[PDB]
């Protein structure tokens, strides 16, 4: 639940890696060279905005503590995701990848509840948002969170 020691040290080493001059702080130029090596190919305007969000003391640079606070909150997010998705997969009855009207018919049975096909499609359409009559991982995560 809280950062592991192993994660604390990984974040440090990732910090020291991004900090190429050893300044103690990640500047806007180091952030973009790090975001590319992370695959990314970001735009100046985004880098700036990253900087402004992670920075807390107006330096326009990221020190270790600002980086740690950010990484802490990302990993936190990533683990709440992985946990909502353990449940998703309970509701993905046939392990298809998305919760469909078939999955909910079956769930409904397995709870001894007699809900109509119409009663169930409403559900889908509330949580649905790309108009495919399915509930995918992001839709589920969303209607939980």
């Amino acid at each position: 639940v809280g950062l592991t020691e192993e994660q604390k040290q990984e974040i440090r080493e990732a910090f020291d890696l991004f900090d190429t001059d050893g300044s103690g702080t990640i500047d806007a130029k180091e952030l973009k060279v790090a975001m590319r090596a992370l695959g990314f190919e970001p735009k100046k305007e985004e880098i700036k905005k990253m900087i402004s969000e992670i920075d807390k003391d107006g330096s326009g640079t990221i020190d270790f503590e600002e980086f740690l606070t950010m990484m802490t909150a990302k990993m936190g997010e990533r683990d709440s995701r992985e946990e909502i998705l353990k449940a998703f997969r309970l509701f993905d009855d046939d392990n298809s990848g998305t919760i469909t009207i078939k999955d909910l018919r079956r769930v409904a049975k397995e709870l001894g509840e007699n809900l109509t096909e119409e009663e169930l499609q409403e559900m889908i359409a509330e949580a649905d948002r790309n108009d495919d009559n399915e509930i995918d991982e992001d839709e589920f995560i969303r209607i939980m969170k």
């Binding site: 946990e83 909502i84 449940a87 709870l111 509840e113 409403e122």
Partner: peptide, 20 residues
């Protein structure tokens, strides 16, 4: 486990008994 239990035990019957 706390997530999931709280969905089933409370969240699901509430939602069900609504559509009813």
């Amino acid at each position: 486990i706390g997530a999931v239990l709280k969905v089933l035990t409370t969240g699901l019957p509430a939602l069900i008994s609504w559509i009813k």
